Protein backbone atom coordinates (compact mmCIF):
# COMPACT_ATOMS: atom_id res chain seq x y z
CA UNK A 1 0.00 0.00 0.00
CA UNK A 2 1.11 3.51 -0.90
CA UNK A 3 2.07 5.97 1.86
CA UNK A 4 1.54 9.65 1.74
CA UNK A 5 3.43 11.87 4.16
CA UNK A 6 3.02 15.38 5.42
CA UNK A 7 5.61 17.36 7.44
CA UNK A 8 5.54 20.83 8.88
CA UNK A 9 8.65 22.50 10.22
CA UNK A 10 9.32 25.77 12.06
CA UNK A 11 13.05 26.61 12.05
CA UNK A 12 14.48 29.35 14.24
CA UNK A 13 17.96 30.31 13.05
CA UNK A 14 20.02 32.39 15.50
CA UNK A 15 23.04 34.57 14.64
CA UNK A 16 25.22 36.30 17.22
CA UNK A 17 23.02 35.21 20.11
CA UNK A 18 19.53 36.38 19.28
CA UNK A 19 20.97 39.46 17.61
CA UNK A 20 19.82 38.15 14.22
CA UNK A 21 17.01 35.55 14.09
CA UNK A 22 15.26 34.07 11.02
CA UNK A 23 12.13 31.88 11.16
CA UNK A 24 11.17 29.40 8.44
CA UNK A 25 7.92 27.49 8.26
CA UNK A 26 8.07 24.72 5.66
CA UNK A 27 5.43 22.37 4.43
CA UNK A 28 6.61 19.20 2.82
CA UNK A 29 4.43 16.69 0.99
CA UNK A 30 6.29 13.39 0.95
CA UNK A 31 9.83 14.65 0.14
CA UNK A 32 8.96 17.84 -1.73
CA UNK A 33 8.72 21.14 0.16
CA UNK A 34 5.66 22.81 -1.36
CA UNK A 35 5.29 26.17 0.48
CA UNK A 36 7.31 28.09 3.09
CA UNK A 37 7.20 31.24 5.24
CA UNK A 38 10.56 32.99 5.51
CA UNK A 39 10.74 35.75 8.13
CA UNK A 40 13.15 37.55 5.84
CA UNK A 41 10.49 37.61 3.17
CA UNK A 42 7.48 38.40 5.30
CA UNK A 43 5.06 36.19 3.46
CA UNK A 44 4.41 32.70 2.12
CA UNK A 45 5.78 31.59 -1.22
CA UNK A 46 5.00 28.47 -3.15
CA UNK A 47 8.19 26.37 -3.40
CA UNK A 48 6.50 24.04 -5.86
CA UNK A 49 3.28 24.48 -7.80
CA UNK A 50 1.50 22.07 -5.39
CA UNK A 51 1.91 24.77 -2.80
CA UNK A 52 0.74 27.69 -4.92
CA UNK A 53 -2.84 27.43 -3.56
CA UNK A 54 -1.60 27.65 0.01
CA UNK A 55 0.68 30.57 -0.69
CA UNK A 56 -2.13 32.49 -2.43
CA UNK A 57 -4.52 31.60 0.35
CA UNK A 58 -2.39 32.10 3.42
CA UNK A 59 -1.10 35.40 2.12
CA UNK A 60 -4.72 36.44 1.81
CA UNK A 61 -5.26 35.65 5.53
CA UNK A 62 -3.56 38.63 7.09
CA UNK A 63 -3.92 37.89 10.74
CA UNK A 64 -1.91 34.75 10.04
CA UNK A 65 0.88 36.87 8.38
CA UNK A 66 1.09 39.26 11.28
CA UNK A 67 1.20 36.35 13.73
CA UNK A 68 4.18 34.81 11.77
CA UNK A 69 6.03 38.06 11.30
CA UNK A 70 6.05 38.32 15.13
CA UNK A 71 7.01 34.70 15.87
CA UNK A 72 10.64 35.79 15.65
CA UNK A 73 10.17 37.34 19.11
CA UNK A 74 7.21 35.53 20.63
CA UNK A 75 8.41 32.08 19.53
CA UNK A 76 11.99 32.13 18.38
CA UNK A 77 13.66 34.43 20.93
CA UNK A 78 11.38 33.19 23.71
CA UNK A 79 12.30 29.50 23.29
CA UNK A 80 15.98 30.31 22.90
CA UNK A 81 15.49 32.18 26.13
CA UNK A 82 13.84 29.27 27.89
CA UNK A 83 16.25 26.73 26.52
CA UNK A 84 19.56 28.53 26.77
CA UNK A 85 20.75 27.10 30.10
CA UNK A 86 20.62 23.43 29.06
CA UNK A 87 21.34 23.77 25.30
CA UNK A 88 23.36 26.81 24.17
CA UNK A 89 25.46 26.51 27.32
CA UNK A 90 25.73 22.74 27.58
CA UNK A 91 29.30 21.65 28.08
CA UNK A 92 30.64 18.14 28.32
CA UNK A 93 34.41 17.46 28.26
CA UNK A 94 35.88 14.95 25.82
CA UNK A 95 37.45 11.60 26.83
CA UNK A 96 40.75 11.45 24.84
CA UNK A 97 42.39 8.03 24.09
CA UNK A 98 45.41 7.26 21.89
CA UNK A 99 46.13 3.86 20.54
CA UNK A 100 47.70 2.22 17.48
CA UNK A 101 45.08 0.56 15.30
CA UNK A 102 47.14 -2.56 14.77
CA UNK A 103 49.72 -4.50 16.78
CA UNK A 104 52.10 -4.72 13.74
CA UNK A 105 55.70 -4.39 15.28
CA UNK A 106 58.04 -1.42 14.95
CA UNK A 107 59.20 0.18 11.78
CA UNK A 108 56.08 -0.85 9.99
CA UNK A 109 53.49 1.61 8.91
CA UNK A 110 50.74 2.06 11.48
CA UNK A 111 47.65 4.20 12.04
CA UNK A 112 47.68 6.00 15.33
CA UNK A 113 44.16 6.66 16.49
CA UNK A 114 43.19 9.62 18.61
CA UNK A 115 39.72 8.82 19.99
CA UNK A 116 37.84 11.91 21.27
CA UNK A 117 34.48 11.16 22.70
CA UNK A 118 31.49 12.20 24.82
CA UNK A 119 31.93 15.89 24.18
CA UNK A 120 29.38 18.68 23.83
CA UNK A 121 29.25 20.94 21.95
CA UNK A 122 30.29 19.80 18.49
CA UNK A 123 33.15 22.17 17.63
CA UNK A 124 36.59 20.84 18.60
CA UNK A 125 40.18 20.91 17.14
CA UNK A 126 42.24 17.69 17.34
CA UNK A 127 45.90 18.05 16.26
CA UNK A 128 48.73 15.56 15.99
CA UNK A 129 52.34 16.17 16.97
CA UNK A 130 55.54 14.11 16.53
CA UNK A 131 58.44 15.05 18.77
CA UNK A 132 56.61 18.31 19.50
CA UNK A 133 56.25 19.23 15.87
CA UNK A 134 52.71 19.35 14.48
CA UNK A 135 51.95 16.71 11.89
CA UNK A 136 49.47 17.90 9.27
CA UNK A 137 49.89 15.22 6.60
CA UNK A 138 48.66 11.67 6.76
CA UNK A 139 45.73 12.57 8.95
CA UNK A 140 42.53 10.61 8.38
CA UNK A 141 39.48 11.87 10.38
CA UNK A 142 35.97 10.39 10.72
CA UNK A 143 34.67 13.89 11.16
CA UNK A 144 32.26 14.76 13.89
CA UNK A 145 29.80 12.02 14.80
CA UNK A 146 26.62 12.94 16.57
CA UNK A 147 25.56 10.08 18.94
CA UNK A 148 21.95 11.24 19.32
CA UNK A 149 22.20 11.59 23.17
CA UNK A 150 23.66 15.14 23.50
CA UNK A 151 27.25 13.99 23.05
CA UNK A 152 29.67 13.77 20.10
CA UNK A 153 32.72 11.66 19.21
CA UNK A 154 35.42 11.80 16.54
CA UNK A 155 38.46 9.62 15.64
CA UNK A 156 41.52 11.26 14.14
CA UNK A 157 44.20 8.95 12.76
CA UNK A 158 47.78 9.61 11.93
CA UNK A 159 49.62 7.54 9.38
CA UNK A 160 52.99 6.78 11.04
CA UNK A 161 55.99 4.45 10.77
CA UNK A 162 57.07 4.59 14.43
CA UNK A 163 60.70 4.48 15.20
CA UNK A 164 62.06 3.92 18.68
CA UNK A 165 61.55 6.65 21.24
CA UNK A 166 59.33 8.75 19.01
CA UNK A 167 56.76 10.62 21.19
CA UNK A 168 53.34 11.20 19.46
CA UNK A 169 50.77 13.60 20.99
CA UNK A 170 47.12 14.20 20.20
CA UNK A 171 46.06 17.68 21.27
CA UNK A 172 42.38 18.52 21.74
CA UNK A 173 40.94 22.02 21.95
CA UNK A 174 37.27 22.22 23.05
CA UNK A 175 35.11 24.94 24.75
CA UNK A 176 34.60 22.72 27.77
CA UNK A 177 38.27 23.15 28.73
CA UNK A 178 40.59 26.10 29.65
CA UNK A 179 43.82 24.43 28.40
CA UNK A 180 44.14 21.88 25.51
CA UNK A 181 43.89 18.24 26.35
CA UNK A 182 46.86 16.12 25.31
CA UNK A 183 47.58 12.42 25.28
CA UNK A 184 51.03 11.03 24.34
CA UNK A 185 51.96 7.70 22.86
CA UNK A 186 55.48 6.38 23.12
CA UNK A 187 56.66 4.09 20.30
CA UNK B 1 24.87 30.94 12.08
CA UNK B 2 25.09 29.93 15.76
CA UNK B 3 22.10 27.67 16.51
CA UNK B 4 18.86 26.40 15.04
CA UNK B 5 15.86 25.13 17.00
CA UNK B 6 13.48 23.09 14.87
CA UNK B 7 9.84 22.26 15.57
CA UNK B 8 9.10 19.28 13.41
CA UNK B 9 5.88 17.33 12.98
CA UNK B 10 4.58 14.75 10.56
CA UNK B 11 1.53 12.74 9.77
CA UNK B 12 1.73 9.57 7.71
CA UNK B 13 -0.91 7.49 5.95
CA UNK B 14 -2.13 4.89 5.81
CA UNK B 15 -0.25 4.31 9.02
CA UNK B 16 -1.92 7.25 10.70
CA UNK B 17 1.31 7.80 12.59
CA UNK B 18 2.12 11.29 13.75
CA UNK B 19 5.03 13.00 15.46
CA UNK B 20 5.71 16.22 17.31
CA UNK B 21 9.21 17.19 18.48
CA UNK B 22 11.85 19.87 19.01
CA UNK B 23 15.35 19.85 17.80
CA UNK B 24 18.34 21.85 18.90
CA UNK B 25 21.35 21.58 16.56
CA UNK B 26 20.62 17.99 15.65
CA UNK B 27 19.56 16.84 19.02
CA UNK B 28 16.04 16.08 20.18
CA UNK B 29 14.94 18.38 23.02
CA UNK B 30 11.69 16.46 23.56
CA UNK B 31 8.81 14.81 21.68
CA UNK B 32 5.14 14.29 22.65
CA UNK B 33 3.99 10.73 23.25
CA UNK B 34 0.73 10.91 21.24
CA UNK B 35 -0.67 7.74 22.88
CA UNK B 36 0.13 8.69 26.49
CA UNK B 37 -0.44 12.29 25.51
CA UNK B 38 2.72 13.36 27.35
CA UNK B 39 5.86 15.41 26.84
CA UNK B 40 8.98 13.23 26.92
CA UNK B 41 12.29 15.17 27.44
CA UNK B 42 15.39 13.71 25.72
CA UNK B 43 17.45 14.34 28.87
CA UNK B 44 15.40 14.10 32.10
CA UNK B 45 17.22 17.12 33.41
CA UNK B 46 15.66 19.27 30.62
CA UNK B 47 12.24 19.04 32.20
CA UNK B 48 13.52 20.84 35.33
CA UNK B 49 14.04 23.91 33.28
CA UNK B 50 11.11 24.11 30.93
CA UNK B 51 7.53 23.00 30.56
CA UNK B 52 5.49 22.01 27.51
CA UNK B 53 1.76 21.30 27.48
CA UNK B 54 1.27 18.15 25.40
CA UNK B 55 -2.36 18.81 24.41
CA UNK B 56 -1.12 21.48 22.01
CA UNK B 57 0.95 19.03 20.07
CA UNK B 58 -2.07 16.77 19.81
CA UNK B 59 -4.00 19.63 18.20
CA UNK B 60 -1.19 20.30 15.82
CA UNK B 61 -1.17 16.69 14.73
CA UNK B 62 -4.85 16.98 13.89
CA UNK B 63 -4.38 19.91 11.49
CA UNK B 64 -1.50 17.84 10.01
CA UNK B 65 -3.73 14.84 9.53
CA UNK B 66 -6.24 17.11 7.85
CA UNK B 67 -3.77 18.90 5.65
CA UNK B 68 -2.28 15.60 4.57
CA UNK B 69 -5.66 14.48 3.24
CA UNK B 70 -6.01 17.72 1.27
CA UNK B 71 -2.50 17.37 -0.18
CA UNK B 72 -2.70 13.69 -1.07
CA UNK B 73 -5.73 14.38 -3.21
CA UNK B 74 -4.27 17.70 -4.49
CA UNK B 75 -1.30 15.72 -5.72
CA UNK B 76 -3.54 13.39 -7.77
CA UNK B 77 -2.75 10.97 -5.01
CA UNK B 78 1.00 10.71 -5.53
CA UNK B 79 2.37 8.33 -2.90
CA UNK B 80 5.78 8.63 -1.23
CA UNK B 81 8.83 7.01 -2.85
CA UNK B 82 10.61 4.82 -0.35
CA UNK B 83 14.28 5.74 0.28
CA UNK B 84 15.95 2.83 2.19
CA UNK B 85 18.18 3.71 5.14
CA UNK B 86 21.96 3.83 5.53
CA UNK B 87 22.78 1.83 8.70
CA UNK B 88 25.90 2.09 10.87
CA UNK B 89 26.72 0.36 14.09
CA UNK B 90 29.26 1.86 16.52
CA UNK B 91 30.03 2.10 20.17
CA UNK B 92 29.98 5.00 22.59
CA UNK B 93 33.68 4.75 23.18
CA UNK B 94 36.76 2.53 22.56
CA UNK B 95 35.93 -0.96 23.53
CA UNK B 96 37.80 -2.52 26.39
CA UNK B 97 37.01 -6.04 27.45
CA UNK B 98 34.98 -6.13 30.63
CA UNK B 99 34.23 -2.47 30.36
CA UNK B 100 30.50 -1.67 29.99
CA UNK B 101 29.94 0.10 26.64
CA UNK B 102 27.05 1.01 24.34
CA UNK B 103 26.34 -0.15 20.78
CA UNK B 104 24.73 2.60 18.74
CA UNK B 105 22.77 1.62 15.56
CA UNK B 106 22.53 4.73 13.42
CA UNK B 107 19.78 4.67 10.76
CA UNK B 108 19.98 7.62 8.35
CA UNK B 109 18.63 9.07 5.08
CA UNK B 110 15.31 7.20 4.89
CA UNK B 111 11.63 7.87 4.25
CA UNK B 112 8.90 7.24 5.12
CA UNK B 113 9.44 7.26 8.89
CA UNK B 114 8.59 3.61 9.60
CA UNK B 115 11.41 1.07 10.36
CA UNK B 116 11.67 -2.13 12.40
CA UNK B 117 14.93 -2.51 14.38
CA UNK B 118 16.16 -5.55 16.29
CA UNK B 119 19.39 -6.09 18.20
CA UNK B 120 20.62 -9.64 17.83
CA UNK B 121 23.05 -11.22 20.23
CA UNK B 122 24.73 -14.30 18.67
CA UNK B 123 21.76 -14.24 16.34
CA UNK B 124 19.22 -14.17 19.13
CA UNK B 125 17.36 -10.88 19.74
CA UNK B 126 18.34 -8.69 22.73
CA UNK B 127 16.02 -6.32 24.66
CA UNK B 128 17.75 -5.75 27.99
CA UNK B 129 18.44 -2.04 28.41
CA UNK B 130 17.73 -1.08 24.81
CA UNK B 131 16.40 2.39 23.85
CA UNK B 132 16.05 4.44 20.69
CA UNK B 133 15.17 7.95 19.57
CA UNK B 134 12.10 9.07 17.60
CA UNK B 135 12.47 10.14 13.93
CA UNK B 136 14.83 13.09 13.70
CA UNK B 137 14.30 15.48 10.80
CA UNK B 138 16.93 16.06 8.11
CA UNK B 139 17.28 19.12 5.78
CA UNK B 140 16.61 16.91 2.75
CA UNK B 141 13.36 15.92 4.45
CA UNK B 142 14.41 12.36 5.06
CA UNK B 143 14.76 11.13 8.64
CA UNK B 144 17.38 9.92 11.22
CA UNK B 145 16.98 7.55 14.18
CA UNK B 146 19.23 5.89 16.80
CA UNK B 147 18.97 2.63 18.66
CA UNK B 148 21.11 1.82 21.69
CA UNK B 149 22.33 -1.40 23.24
CA UNK B 150 24.29 -1.23 26.56
CA UNK B 151 26.63 -4.21 26.54
CA UNK B 152 29.62 -5.76 28.21
CA UNK B 153 32.48 -6.23 25.71
CA UNK B 154 33.63 -9.84 25.13
CA UNK B 155 35.29 -12.03 22.51
CA UNK B 156 32.59 -14.64 22.97
CA UNK B 157 29.80 -13.15 20.95
CA UNK B 158 29.11 -11.22 17.59
CA UNK B 159 26.39 -8.37 17.28
CA UNK B 160 24.02 -7.19 14.58
CA UNK B 161 21.57 -4.38 14.27
CA UNK B 162 18.68 -5.69 12.08
CA UNK B 163 16.80 -3.00 10.16
CA UNK B 164 13.58 -3.51 8.14
CA UNK B 165 12.34 -0.67 5.88
CA UNK B 166 9.97 -0.68 2.87
CA UNK B 167 12.72 0.60 0.58
CA UNK B 168 14.94 -2.46 1.36
CA UNK B 169 14.69 -5.65 -0.72
CA UNK B 170 15.50 -7.63 2.48
CA UNK B 171 16.23 -6.87 6.19
CA UNK B 172 19.64 -5.28 6.60
CA UNK B 173 21.78 -6.79 9.33
CA UNK B 174 24.82 -4.58 10.33
CA UNK B 175 27.45 -6.50 12.29
CA UNK B 176 29.73 -5.62 15.21
CA UNK B 177 32.13 -7.78 17.09
CA UNK B 178 35.02 -7.04 19.55
CA UNK B 179 38.44 -7.35 18.03
Amino acid sequence: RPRFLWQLKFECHFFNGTERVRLLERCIYNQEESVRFDSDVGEYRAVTELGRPDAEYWNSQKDLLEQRRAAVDTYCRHNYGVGESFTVQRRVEPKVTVYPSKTQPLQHHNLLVCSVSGFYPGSIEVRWFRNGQEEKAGVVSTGLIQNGDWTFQTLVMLETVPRSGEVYTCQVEHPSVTSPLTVEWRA
Amino acid sequence: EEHVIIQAEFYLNPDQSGEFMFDFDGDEIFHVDMAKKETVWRLEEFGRFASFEAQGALANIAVDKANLEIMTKRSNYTPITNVPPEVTVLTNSPVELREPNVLICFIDKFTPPVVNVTWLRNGKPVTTGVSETVFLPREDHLFRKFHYLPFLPSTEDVYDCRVEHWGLDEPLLKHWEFD
Partner: peptide
Protein backbone atom coordinates in the same frame (compact mmCIF):
# COMPACT_ATOMS: atom_id res chain seq x y z
CA UNK C 1 11.38 30.62 32.32
CA UNK C 2 9.30 27.50 31.82
CA UNK C 3 6.78 27.55 28.93
CA UNK C 4 8.27 26.17 25.81
CA UNK C 5 6.23 27.70 23.00
CA UNK C 6 5.16 26.19 19.69
CA UNK C 7 3.52 27.37 16.45
CA UNK C 8 0.57 25.67 14.80
CA UNK C 9 -0.01 25.12 11.17
CA UNK C 10 -2.79 26.82 9.29
CA UNK C 11 -5.37 25.05 7.17
CA UNK C 12 -4.52 24.05 3.61
CA UNK C 13 -6.49 25.53 0.79
CA UNK C 14 -9.24 22.91 0.19
Amino acid sequence: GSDWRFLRGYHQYA
